[PDB]
Design a protein around this ligand. Structure first.
Ligand SMILES: *C\C=C(C)/C=C/C=C(C)/C=C/C1=C(C)CCCC1(C)C
Length: 137
């Protein structure tokens, strides 16, 4: 479908609770929550190949992958992982991650296009699910 677009966050839920699972201390969590209110996602999708640029006010990175082929990225708290994206439905993809070194919570993310034109991203650490909602800019 059409994940392609420039997406601006309109809602962020449970992000602090996710970072807490990930071991981030309280005051860095609060500043990161503030940073998540400026979270923007730029997506270019060509077939099952995705170019995704995620950014806040002072930081930007790119995540490029093809559905079904392993790649390397980082968890949201910054630890390197191996990742594999698969479709779950026409408009939703799920990414499973595996830490490259050491241990830690089981992390994953998802992206979904709703039939209202919203992008819904979730991020998971063990038990805790962060949900962020975007609209096209
Ligand atoms: C939606 C798909 C992918 C691959 C996105 C991954 C996004 C992140 C690891 C984003 C982290 C951020 C959050 C949620 C808010 C503060 C700072 C970032 C923008 C880096």
């Amino acid at each position: 479908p059409n994940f392609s677009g420039n997406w601006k966050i309109i809602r962020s839920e449970n992000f602090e609770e996710l970072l807490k699972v990930l071991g981030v201390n309280v005051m860095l969590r609060k500043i990161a929550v503030a940073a998540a209110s400026k979270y923007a996602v730029e997506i270019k999708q060509e077939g099952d190949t995705f170019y995704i640029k995620v950014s806040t006010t002072v930081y930007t990175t790119e995540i490029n992958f093809k559905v079904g082929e392993e790649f390397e990225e980082q968890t949201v708290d910054g630890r390197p992982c191996k990742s594999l994206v698969k479709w779950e439905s026409e408009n939703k993809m799920v990414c499973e991650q595996k830490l490259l070194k050491g241990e830690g919570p089981k992390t994953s993310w998802t992206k979904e296009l709703t039939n209202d034109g919203e992008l819904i991203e979730t991020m998971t650490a063990d038990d805790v699910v962060c949900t962020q909602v975007f609209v096209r800019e």
